[model samples]
Target chain A: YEKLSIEEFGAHLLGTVDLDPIYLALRRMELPEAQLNRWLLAYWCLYNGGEASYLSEFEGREFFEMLNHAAENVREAPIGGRWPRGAERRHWRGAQATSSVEYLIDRYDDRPEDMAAYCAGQGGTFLEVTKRVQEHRLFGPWIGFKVADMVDRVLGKPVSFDNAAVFMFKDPYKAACIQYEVNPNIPDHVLADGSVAPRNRELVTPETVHHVAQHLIEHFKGFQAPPLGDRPVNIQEVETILCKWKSHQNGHYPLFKDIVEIREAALPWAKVSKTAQAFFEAMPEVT
Target chain B: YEKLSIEEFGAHLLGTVDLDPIYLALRRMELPEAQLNRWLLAYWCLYNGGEASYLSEFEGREFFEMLNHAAENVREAPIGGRWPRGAERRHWRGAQATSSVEYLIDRYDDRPEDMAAYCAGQGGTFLEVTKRVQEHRLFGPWIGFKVADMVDRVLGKPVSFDNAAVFMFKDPYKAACIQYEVNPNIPDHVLADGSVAPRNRELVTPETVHHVAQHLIEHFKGFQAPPLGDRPVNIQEVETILCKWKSHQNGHYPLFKDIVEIREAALPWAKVSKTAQAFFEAMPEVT
Candidate 1:
């Protein structure tokens, strides 16, 4: 197959994403103040494979009911749907506020605005805000980045990360770098017998990865950056798009047509917030 | 090295264990009634790599303090020392009893005698008690066996699981099966290419594993079962010993001289239960 240009490749891979349902609920939940912590947690759960988690299904329909489930007195309830990596104990059922359940119960003090303020308290930058989201237990780099990005989007900021331009040495990204020919420099070295040595395509080191990022930027600038909804995809989007693009390129995951398709795949029972429903309804699928 | 007889092998491998300290603490803590649930939780925590779990360190010294940490109001405290497999959301921080923390606080309802009765109330057999222990969430097959074994020992009953005669298809047990030459019936299937099959050594199927357990019992009948403290190594002990023997055989773990040595390695700061301390002090290291 012919190589697609950076914009063309990025568009087919990421353009179909619609995060409006998740983002809209944060601002427009039925009892926004009472449901603030619950929504933040539900978003964290759903975004990171907790679709069937204790809280994710109830996100839009019943705020108090969700809180009632999250209450400290309600200890018999299941706290983890897809439990985090390091947790093994059953402390959530104890009388104390030992786990993240208690952190939500005690830390927020039942005020949604304070929780919102805390999410953005660190600063306007994506990296700064991720540190705040990560302050919650077991919230690591990958989830923190996604949640932090959502935080900036809901606040209506032009979100750009400190390391947006740098290519991460993580999954699907390294594979995408190889496919994209992200690194074309450092001419092939010759062996003593004069045959060309293998691998200028395998980009690993930071310096080599930097070459790949520069190559991508050159192509991205020549062609316009792909659109996700109304806004043009930014450097941060390019970083994430490359990660997904590799999975799509290699038959690991399929590309969805639009945001609605993505949400439908995650949870069919997931209720679209009224605001999110209006937003998506206005932007018809480009059929 | 030459293969030692199964009786000789079982002796050196299992003869060093001392489980008295952990068992004795269950009955003799200063505040046994108030400290009952706390000690049980701590035992579960320490046995499964939770030596530094929120409650493990407090089993002998401060039961009330440990309970305080497990309280629903104490949500800020860390519930998971290492964290279990499936927990991703921060539901523990919410106002609910959605995690294991609440289960502990609510399950026994502050009356230690009832909790003690609940543990043994299931029945006299190991399998029966494991079912009770497993009723606690995330108390899976592996941990339930160990915790239930400890429970049976504490209650002073004949602690043989129903499956004591069968070799488990799980790890170390499988490895021990191969080492003990448990499946002599597994004849080498000759290949048509004129070569004898490479593996009568690798046992995977239940029929083969059953053969291994039978071989073990046959050898055990001739030589007296090795002693672990005062009791002859029962079939349950044989089952558990095979697990550790494989680790020792593979050089992944070392054999201990006595139970005190094993306890020392897990947590040097681990306090001896008064009755256990007396028992061990009387036994003396057989140097």
Candidate 2:
């Protein structure tokens, strides 16, 4: 019932959870190299709610598995078709190389619809089980899918996990190409809302995480920005505050406690009570 | 900011809404009876977060435009070899039936993929749009979809929106059927929590409403009730409450104000005081 600052809120046991297990796995999966990173980034951008700026913005272990599934799809793609004999077999050997999934999606993507359509029908073995997790509201309290599973489904035909490590090594500069191929559903050029600049294919990167998360992150951030319109602040207000903080910045956003009119400087969300106490001691003047 | 009794809320908004347009235009439109009802129901459901009891709860301007779109679609569905005919006509008619370009997704859906994959491929168009609306913080607000368009998309086949009056005439008897077809994403016989139950395809009637609203509507429906478990009430809480209220009496659910309470209570949200107050007072007092 008290006005908990982001710091105290984060540190408070059962108050602001630090790292959701599902979100964490999604954040720190041991993906292969280039292709793996590209797909992971694309998958993250597309699926990550974007409300939180933290790595673990999306909850549910399925996020990790889902990305893994995409990687598997890319790896096991039929050989001798698009890549050099087994080019698709070795795309992600390193994080910095150009054998990324995005590059593959673009250079060889004369068939976005076929890829999308292929995914629509052939979701692989994990399809039903994964859907059950999503539908069961297993990870709903933490994170969720914005457009269900369109992008991944569309990307299925062109990618595979069977030889994911090999695909990761195929092309390192292919992040945009891969994303463009896989996620054609999103408009090529995304219009800017207030915070995010308008973006297109040229903007995608190993760091870029959108298709859906972009707008959502912006929208939720708007909610946390000191009650702009006629909206009254209340208990439910904390829900957005918690969710947004967790989503954007990938949970690394600092926590800050608030009460007694201390809205001057931006406060950070605390990781532990030690951090909360430390923040308070360091800036006793704020309260 | 204060707790409110349900009834006082309704009386405050007696004349705020104007429905004369719907009333006056009904006779002149030469609208088929069933078509009109479908549109009306679709409007009510969409405006009320896809709740079933919305019809008895809130009365407002007819969502005729939504219904019209739905009606048009139904009249032009494809059948057998008529798929081409439907598609051609739809291209001309701007998506009149399932075969039309307006509603049915004409993309490649033949490829194999999981349900989530299909959703990723635009299979979740309506669901995505609705969920996106939710993420946009437009929760519990009005945004109607074309039922005919919906029917086209969901069945993955051509549907005729022609002469909806015949269906409307059978509505009271086929209420159950309508309910069954509602929320196409939900598979029959399973609750949102993934529990399986007998397939429910019974017809719903006006008699069904009287039971929930008038008789057993308030038997203390809890989220932790016998089967559904007690996961501190959140979004699904609202869903469960609405479902129980609607299905409790096989039809009897409280009027609009309580509908607001039912929804808000399930969520930690409260309706605008004036709106809730007006809605409550305008309707009969429930014990």
Candidate 3:
């Protein structure tokens, strides 16, 4: 089991009964860096949860977007990208960049550049990837900001520059001891110890994420990792992730077990490091 | 892993898909003794097979009566307690001992002196015991005659004997490597090596008996026990047990594994016993 690879992690997800909750949980992180990576991981985990079973074929993109909606429900206080009700800072740049066609059109009535890269070498012209991101939106502007923030923190603003996407994600026993409290045909596979597997399962969704987060928030409040530095997490990470979750409104998610497996299995890489770690922590604590 | 009991056996039944065809297969036997026993065992296995998952509480009695109906299906077989085709065995003889009822009545009329001793020994008068057995109709007749046959075989002649009413009644896995699918809610209590312990199981009844018998007869043909014994084999036994299912219909055949664990654990006794052994040999060869 330990020798398993990143692809196999997805195998677990598809074979699993559900996955949306995983993505939902990822959206709760306040740190922009952490939130993006978590989404990337959840996306990957959903993509690979089960080798033989793929929900995407059955659920489609609409289902994936539902998780984001669910995440929005209980987003951290002071929503948008920042945290702390009163403290204000620029999150969304709003409108177009100084060199952008939108700005040029507004000023000189000229055609906006389609498929053109903006300030951070992202969005605007590349409609496909850019539209999903909405670079001009609150979180969108904040994203490029974090790319700058992370670079400054690590390599100093003079150098932190890069482009990449990152994200994260999250049987049976038998009859006699317990009859089908529901359908008769369904086989409740039993384990050595008397326990029953749930009848149906699906990927985690945004709603599931919020549901799980609420559950954890209530259950593991003390363990809730703060946002910020390695030694101390601030409330910001939670606020950021929650904002994205609400905005994305995708309800689906990866199965919890698949999330961690995918994280550890992926090769060590800079973009995915924080996201994967947070994804692992997002899984519900099993008894 | 063939050490199972009735309850564990029941779970196995529920875990899998429909077993109706299995019962149908077992019903297609030739020998009277083999047919009846196979039917009964199979019937028991089907209902009690999956972790003591009973068919329905309200329908238990109805299920039991089905056994008598099943006996009617194999009426031509001597084991069904019906005399040979040409034999017109009287249901009643002269008042001294005419039919099954008269037979007892005559004992009292013919041997007044020994009547009390005989009745006392057998508990109650012949009329009373006869009435109780009559409740089974086909089952009653078959049991009455078959037991009579057993006693005759033991004593050489049918001596007018008497015993208490109760006294006469008398007696009686998987592989992980292939990733054979298992459900969590329903545990494979029937261990990998087929060891089962009775606990947390539903009780058994006549309907489940017929259900199990029907299931076995439907699925197995040319089914036989191994030349060797001493291993746990609840799954494979399905074929063998159903071979002579009918023999159990009219008589007090030994129970098959109804409850999941009970059936799995029962492999040892079921495998080597005379009845199970015979069914294995008697099973019609199939390609």
- Candidate 2's displacement at residue A282, Å, is 19
Share of the reference A-B contacts seen in candidate 1: 0.00
| Residue lDDT tens for model 1, A54-134 | 343354335324544433444443432322221212232233323444455456554433554576553454534553554
Give me the displacement of residue B144 in model 3, in angstroms.
42
Tens digit per residue, CA lDDT, model 2, A212-263? 3332223333332121212322222233343434433244334332321121
- lDDT, model 1, position A151: 57
Comparing 2 with 3 on TM-score, the higher-scoring candidate is: 2
Q: What does candidate 2 score on TM?
A: 0.20
Q: Per-prediction TM-score, please?
A: 0.39, 0.20, 0.14
Residues B77-139, model 3: lDDT tens digits? 213332111011222112211122222333333322232222122332222322232222111
Which TM-score does chain B of candidate 2 obtain? 0.20
On the 0 to 100 scale, the lDDT of residue A228 in model 3 is: 17
lDDT of 3 at A259: 39
DockQ of predictions, in order shown: 0.01, 0.01, 0.00
lDDT rank order: 1, 2, 3
TM-score-sorted candidate list, best first:
1, 2, 3
lDDT of 2 by residue, B106-166 (tens): 2322211121122222323233322322221112111212332322232232222212111
